[PDB]
UniProtKB/Swiss-Prot annotation, chain A:
Superkingdom classification of source: Bacteria
Family stated for the protein in its record: Belongs to the RNA polymerase beta chain family.
Gene field: rpoB
Annotated protein name in UniProt: DNA-directed RNA polymerase subunit beta
Note: Mutations in the RRDR sequence (residues 423-449) confer rifampicin (Rif) resistance. Rif blocks transcription initiation but not elongation.
Native species: Mycolicibacterium smegmatis (strain ATCC 700084 / mc(2)155) (Mycobacterium smegmatis)
Source lineage: Bacteria, Bacillati, Actinomycetota, Actinomycetes, Mycobacteriales
Description of how the protein assembles with itself and partners: The RNAP catalytic core consists of 2 alpha, 1 beta, 1 beta' and 1 omega subunit. When a sigma factor is associated with the core the holoenzyme is formed, which can initiate transcription. Interacts with RbpA, which partially restores Rif-inhibited transcription.
Swiss-Prot record, chain B:
Main function: DNA-dependent RNA polymerase catalyzes the transcription of DNA into RNA using the four ribonucleoside triphosphates as substrates.
Name of the encoding gene: rpoC
Family: Belongs to the RNA polymerase beta' chain family.
Highest taxon of source: Bacteria
Name of this chain's protein: DNA-directed RNA polymerase subunit beta'
Self-association state and partner proteins as the record states: The RNAP catalytic core consists of 2 alpha, 1 beta, 1 beta' and 1 omega subunit. When a sigma factor is associated with the core the holoenzyme is formed, which can initiate transcription.
Source species: Mycolicibacterium smegmatis (strain ATCC 700084 / mc(2)155) (Mycobacterium smegmatis)
From Swiss-Prot, chain C:
Organism this protein belongs to: Mycolicibacterium smegmatis (strain ATCC 700084 / mc(2)155)
Catalysed reactions, as listed in the record: RNA(n) + a ribonucleoside 5'-triphosphate = RNA(n+1) + diphosphate
Source lineage: Bacteria, Bacillati, Actinomycetota, Actinomycetes, Mycobacteriales
E.C. number(s) listed in UniProt: 2.7.7.6
Gene name for this UniProt entry: rpoA
Name recorded for this polypeptide: DNA-directed RNA polymerase subunit alpha
Transport keyword on record: no
A Gene Ontology biological process term: DNA-templated transcription
GO cellular component terms, A-Z: cytoplasm; DNA-directed RNA polymerase complex
Full-protein residues shown: 1 to 226 of 350
UniProtKB/Swiss-Prot annotation, chain E:
Organism whose genome encodes this protein: Mycolicibacterium smegmatis (strain ATCC 700084 / mc(2)155) (Mycobacterium smegmatis)
GO molecular function, one term: DNA-directed RNA polymerase activity
Top-level taxon of the source organism: Bacteria
A cellular component term, taken from the record's GO annotations: DNA-directed RNA polymerase complex
Keyword Transcription: yes
Protein name from the UniProt record: DNA-directed RNA polymerase subunit omega
GO process annotations (BP): DNA-templated transcription
Residues of the full protein shown: 24 to 106 of 107
Keyword Nucleotidyltransferase in annotation: yes
Quaternary organization: The RNAP catalytic core consists of 2 alpha, 1 beta, 1 beta' and 1 omega subunit. When a sigma factor is associated with the core the holoenzyme is formed, which can initiate transcription.
Gene transcribed to yield this protein: rpoZ
Amino acid sequence: LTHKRRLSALGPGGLSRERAGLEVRDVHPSHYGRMCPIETPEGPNIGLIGSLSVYARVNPFGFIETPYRKVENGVVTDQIDYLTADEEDRHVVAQANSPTDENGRFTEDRVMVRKKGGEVEFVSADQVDYMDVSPRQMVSVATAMIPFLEHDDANRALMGANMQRQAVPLVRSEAPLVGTGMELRAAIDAGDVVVADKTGVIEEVSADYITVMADDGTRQSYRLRKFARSNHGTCANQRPIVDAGQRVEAGQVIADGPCTQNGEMALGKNLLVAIMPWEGHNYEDAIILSNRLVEEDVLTSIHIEEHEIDARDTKLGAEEITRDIPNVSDEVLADLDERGIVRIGAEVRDGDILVGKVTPKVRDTSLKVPHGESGKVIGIRVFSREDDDELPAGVNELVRVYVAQKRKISDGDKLAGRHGNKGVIGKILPVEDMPFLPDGTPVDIILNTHGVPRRMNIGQILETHLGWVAKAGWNIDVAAGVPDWASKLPEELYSAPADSTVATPVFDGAQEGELAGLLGSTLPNRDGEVMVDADGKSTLFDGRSGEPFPYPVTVGYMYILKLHHLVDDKIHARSTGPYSMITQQPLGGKAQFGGQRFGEMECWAMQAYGAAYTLQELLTIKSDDTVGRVKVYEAIVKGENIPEPGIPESFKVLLKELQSLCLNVEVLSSDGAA
Amino acid sequence: LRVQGPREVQIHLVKEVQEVYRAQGVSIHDKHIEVIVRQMLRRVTIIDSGSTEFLPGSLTERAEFEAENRRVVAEGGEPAAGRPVLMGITKASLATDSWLSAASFQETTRVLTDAAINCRSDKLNGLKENVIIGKLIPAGTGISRYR
Amino acid sequence: MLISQRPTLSEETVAENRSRFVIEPLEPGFGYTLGNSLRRTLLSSIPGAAVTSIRIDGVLHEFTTVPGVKEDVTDIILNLKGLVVSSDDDEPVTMYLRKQGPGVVTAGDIVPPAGVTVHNPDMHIATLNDKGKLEVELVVERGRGYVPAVQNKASGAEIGRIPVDSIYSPVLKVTYKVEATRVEQRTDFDKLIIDVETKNSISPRDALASAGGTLVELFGLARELN
Amino acid sequence: MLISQRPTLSEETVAENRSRFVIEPLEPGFGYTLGNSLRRTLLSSIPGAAVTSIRIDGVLHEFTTVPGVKEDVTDIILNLKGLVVSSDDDEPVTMYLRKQGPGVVTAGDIVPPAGVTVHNPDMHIATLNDKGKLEVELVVERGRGYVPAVQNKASGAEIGRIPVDSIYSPVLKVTYKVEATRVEQRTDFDKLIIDVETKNSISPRDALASAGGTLVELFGLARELNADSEHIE
Amino acid sequence: SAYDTPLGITNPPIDELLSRASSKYALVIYAAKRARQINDYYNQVGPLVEPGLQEKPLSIALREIHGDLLEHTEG
Amino acid sequence: NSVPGAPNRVSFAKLREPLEVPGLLDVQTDSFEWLVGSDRWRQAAIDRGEENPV
Amino acid sequence: QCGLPKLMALELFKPFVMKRLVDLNHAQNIKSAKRMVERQRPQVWDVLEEVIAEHPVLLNRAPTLHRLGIQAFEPQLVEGKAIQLHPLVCEAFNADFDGDQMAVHLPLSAEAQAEARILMLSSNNILSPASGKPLAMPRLDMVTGLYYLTTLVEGATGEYQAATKDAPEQGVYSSPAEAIMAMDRGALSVRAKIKVRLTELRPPTDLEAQLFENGWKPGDAWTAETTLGRVMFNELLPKSYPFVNEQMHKKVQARIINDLAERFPMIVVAQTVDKLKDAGFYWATRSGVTVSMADVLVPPQKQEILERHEAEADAIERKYQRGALNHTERNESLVKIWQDATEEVGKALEEFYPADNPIITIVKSGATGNLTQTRTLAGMKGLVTNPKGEFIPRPIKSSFREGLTVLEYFINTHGARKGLADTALRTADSGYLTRRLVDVSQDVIVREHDCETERGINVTLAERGPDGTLIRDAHVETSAFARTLATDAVDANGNVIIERGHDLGDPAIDALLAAGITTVKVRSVLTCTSATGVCAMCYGRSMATGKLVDIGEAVGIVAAQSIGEPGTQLTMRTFHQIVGGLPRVQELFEARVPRNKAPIADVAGRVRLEESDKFFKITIVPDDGGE
Ligand SMILES: [Mg+2]
Ligand SMILES: [Zn+2]
């Protein structure tokens, strides 16, 4: 959804990352309500790529225009005008949150307004021409999905908005307890959910399709995508939510998408979080997880890899996909079918055969599972020119194999909230080791204190508090009268049951006093005990020693996202292998078994240590030398001393290159010419 | 340099650099600044060749200048006259003595021509030219004293 | 101020599956560590039974649909995660389930063999329309703690058989309180209360007995020496 | 069900009164199940006799110092606190120590009643100046663990009575650590280490054995409910 | 002053070894040449001190250095 | 509301939104409909008051 | 030690494991051992554990800003894909665990392994080579834990009491173990003041000579008037280290580690830092430091201050509307008034917070953060810049606790994007300066022990001032400290104080000050007469080792890295496209003619000044009688 709404300044006829200055990257006062100031990439594309504001539309000349309510004589009126920035500079626009009494007159005589200089001022209430239609007119979709946005620093809000886009789908989706009003419309407009076109009743429900009969009497059938691979490899499973015979109205969600529950978006899971340091295992933003999340697959995800192999022709004849590979063991081709394609449902190991192919010389050229990869063969697709496959020239057959892998959360995987509080899982603890509430419930996650104050994203703390107020119900006493702190709560928020979801929009939501009062008004637990005091803290017990911690700890519920930076493919290792040819240095690539680069700064560090021999190994044997490599590898294999290098190989080629230009280059000993 | 002289120039440069760092709350020891500044004042421009082989107007390392002056004066010749010259780190880098290192980052053909007609011998004192050759760096573990 | 009185243990039931066990008297500062040791043993090492693999007629692997059923195979396995069972012997036991036509396939539809029973037949597994035919073969086994889905090619070589993660823990929740019911405040004692709740495949009494038996053997190491 | 293998218990000695015991290999996560409770039983669950009160002549009140002795009243209280007394009778015993003349008065000068013993006679109690003298009566009794100084609201019928913190536990100090070990391709099995330091009225081995027996019975209370479904080793 | 049991590659303490050479750089080759000699012996004076089950030659050389079993001359 | 199946997420908002959030994909679809000169786009344009839009 | 993934270690140590597969006859042909290891057949793992033993590995994080960016560690096999990094070396790598990655290299030859084990090993690289200050020392959680452990609180349970004619002191314990027993029962607070008889801990110097005519030895009892936590902390230090009895601020821990590094072997301090790490983590876990909306206190004085400054702003508005003030000058005045308001609110917040509140506790403990961030959190954000870098006159009076209004947040975003955008340019400028310094420092190597010259430079140690007393220069640690003396320090009576050639450390500084020395002559590389490179004596001691620099060590690259590494902390050139910082540093090292040039006196003499309307003229009458 954000990609479709992306605005890119770089491209054909535009600018480039190489030389675009800060001037074009900087936020501008004309961006208000048109381009999001928060949601932009953090790398070299900083400022060059942004997002359209939620209320903005495009002028037919291509200019971005945003809606404003007309204001006259100090009374706001319902006429909406879409103004461009050039038009808006000729007006005075007031803040939407400005109070107005019956029929629209401003209560106070002075009002915040924006002015042509990109300025903000207290003008007279009769000096206003326009007003913003919503408090969040400036934010994009991903920014609007951050609760308590105004309590988070701009950098961390940017990080959270960016991270929301890289959250991987989970096997089961769960909507956040603390959310905005934006999840539902964002999910619906993203289009991954299936929506009924016209009012009717469900005739059929199946894991694959749903059939509805409209009031017109005509019939509609909807097909669900099951375990389909996304462009990034994430699973795009769609699920039916409606029951047979159910009333379904036009526009009603009929099937959930990969990251939706009951139509509204669900990018993460609600975890019971305690805010405390813990034995140094959450040091420097590391995260501690309960083993429950691994056991119950709370943070498990499915990934589908796609492999291709094509049978072609050459000057020396055609190529054959076949089971009859030369010299391969009888078992190694056991799971292959008659054509030589691995059967569906086979558990394929790293390096195992997927599709057998041979070519003239014959030779073994079969498709094999890459380094580290594994899973179940989920699907096969095949194309042949005998079927008018429309493949390019010089290819006779093509086979695509899909391998499905289910990954549990593991050490080194990144997690993050919606507030930019990213971290790496440093430890997973048994359920009995986690600090647990007096009720006996162990916390799901431990987040270190030392992160919050410095990073300036206390919105994660507030959410946590409200999260508890969302899990445990609340009930405000009204027998004598409404409490003062609750005097701005709508009558519908005076009480709610357990597990009740709430919305706290980004710039018009829960205030501090309301949240504190609700913390004081939470329902007790199953046994009648109020587990968390009015300050949001609880008396946790140490799961190892067993004694209570000497001070209460902040406990609540936080919405946590599993990010796509998983460990499985972020790890590299090498000890010799393929090499470059035009120059003889190693390769570099995730799937090419490449080695690590040694830059000049690392050479500087080695020289500073004075570790001459290690630097020589890195410079010559491990990188360029061919003879040195074969010799050293065989020396290690034979368990003998690594030979001390003699005359460098680079020097001998350089000497002949110099001599070819008629230069007499001579090696001199400390005692004389030699 | 022209008023107070070379040593006072080195002291002044170290003073100014460390003042800039101190005003910014950084804690670099003076000796690193001195190590850097020593290179900025490493060469002398020759006024008169005297009885030496030095070319007038040419830049000369102070150590070589003194060594040849003492040789000639102990052999009855007039020592060459020299003027200290202050150089930025960039120009000090360009004025290197090793033809290998100069060839590695200057116009290679000019460097090679100059070294060839002059018949320069490179002593491989620096780390850069030893890396270029592929030899053990002449520092730490790699020096003759320890090898 | 030496005390000759030995602790005593008693039970107070609160539900069919939950009870509070009182131990008193205890030395001051002693209740928390004893309660925590018992809690750790209860959460970690009480044996149980769980499903270890399943087969479905039309399914080759976990990532597939089955015609006529609302839930895909992954949802079916994740629903079976809610199945609680207790085989009386350690050897694996194969249960069978068969259903045709409309209806809700619940855990009561399972027809287990002797010595094993499903304690929550009301649990929902699947929903079948007119065309839905569901045949499921389940392998139960006894074990301890938690074990991930055993790799198919490692445990055996049967294709179509799809493993599942196994939780061998009949203990649901455990907590403890320690209170100062000291003797007339002339001298100090701690009173320990351990609230234990199980999945109803085993009573709190038997689970606590197992925890105590497990702990005594480990603490007996020091008794063997001189 | 049986387990991979039963643990083994080994011992090392730093000094005659300080041992270090090591249980290895242990099932993952039971090191914290064992060590903390073992330490608590070692500290608090071993009976022993200790000085519970004292009375020194000449300091009936204004308890600052006593003439004829360089040590202050509090220093003498500290010295008496380290006294390793042992009693074979549960009821309180009153004992007397008396010395005069210059020199030093040590624990060996005590003459305990029948069934009462002092294991550290060499311990220095006080130094006596020229023509000085010191007489002190000690109330000793049995208990477990550690007890703060007595509330003594009932006093006033006698003067000069000093309640002192009672160190009944024969164990002086205990500290436990848990570390990783390998038993197979599997990793992260528990190894439990515990330092035990005791007063010379007991050896660390005896303290550990008594604590282990106490825990065995105390958790056997639980298996008195039933015996089935435990680990077997 | 005293120090606790050196674990792993810490033993022998770096200061004890360093006291037997003009510099850390000298110690590096002092250990490396001896390790090469020991490995040659294993392949073809040999280790002067009780080796372990699978101890590396560098550890043996360092433990011999700690014991003052070797002498050297700088270049 | 304008979403029949919406779960009842209670909101802390005080101010009402006088304008609904527009179609979030309109930036793509309206532009493409202009490109192909769709009937819907033409009607919308003449409703906006554009003179004989092309 | 560092933790390596099992699969990663297997692939790195592939040939080394294959050798033992063939030698252990797990495989017959090495060409089959390759397949055996490549398939991870279960036998190989146990071989790896013995191949990996005592074979160090090099760990590197990018960018390598200085020497400590590469460190050697002993690999321990561990489950999972992630490398386990020791928390103390993180600050040397500038690493944190929000996603960072590190590269691992395996030395092969015996020489390379010896270099990794002796030179690059982490335990041998505690001190920074740039300043000699420790880097592998407690941080964050550990600092907070130790600060909580050693803080003294008044009124806690079990604290000391005076004799009152009715009871004794009531706060005395015969041994620290008795205090441990009291703490475990909840009778004694770890932070409560008590008196303890100590026999294993060396007393302070003030007490040692007073209590022991021939010094303290282990077993000799003394009475410490200190909290139990301080005793437990002191038990972590070496047996022969005097009792400190202080609240462990980060500065005090740095001082203690400096003492250990200067006066104890390297292994001793290496073990001590690990012990401090363990204690710090424990007491950080048990310090109770947590964040809640209740702990974020707002000072009640805020609104009165804001109303006062709003009255001042209204007065300026009246004066501007009266024509007495310019627009830009109005902006100036409003900016200054609101800066005063921000300072007032900061003072109010700092005085209102209780000493033990977690938010202020983290800052004041020196663990992390600063008071400015606290004021932004609970006070007021203050003034923020527009894209041109000018302060917007109207401040953000809201705090992040209250939550900003829409326009406050919008105007806040400008500087945030500025900072996000310009960081790469700052890094590039620092790297360029570092590269040029490295290029010029290519051949500066310690070539000989001593050039035997008597040249040197003068270093001022103190200024006598009015009282004629020992006012030592604050920055002396970077000028005189850690150098070789060029000539003997001599008093007014002709007696020496310190010998020629001595290492001018803290003891020497104290001796000189006690003797009334204000200036010394010290050897320097500026004056070294060595024919090639520099000599060890003129350079002095290595800051990392604390001993005379070894022959052959490349001081040039170390100096270049030391100068360049903190470059990003300096004020940078304008990227808006005289301020100091990096722009002037590049100016100084390039020997360019200053833009803000000032003339200097050619001759000594008396100044005759002939000022003009808008120019100055100066004449110097030389005291020598010259021109
Ligand atoms: Mg990071
Ligand atoms: Zn010198």
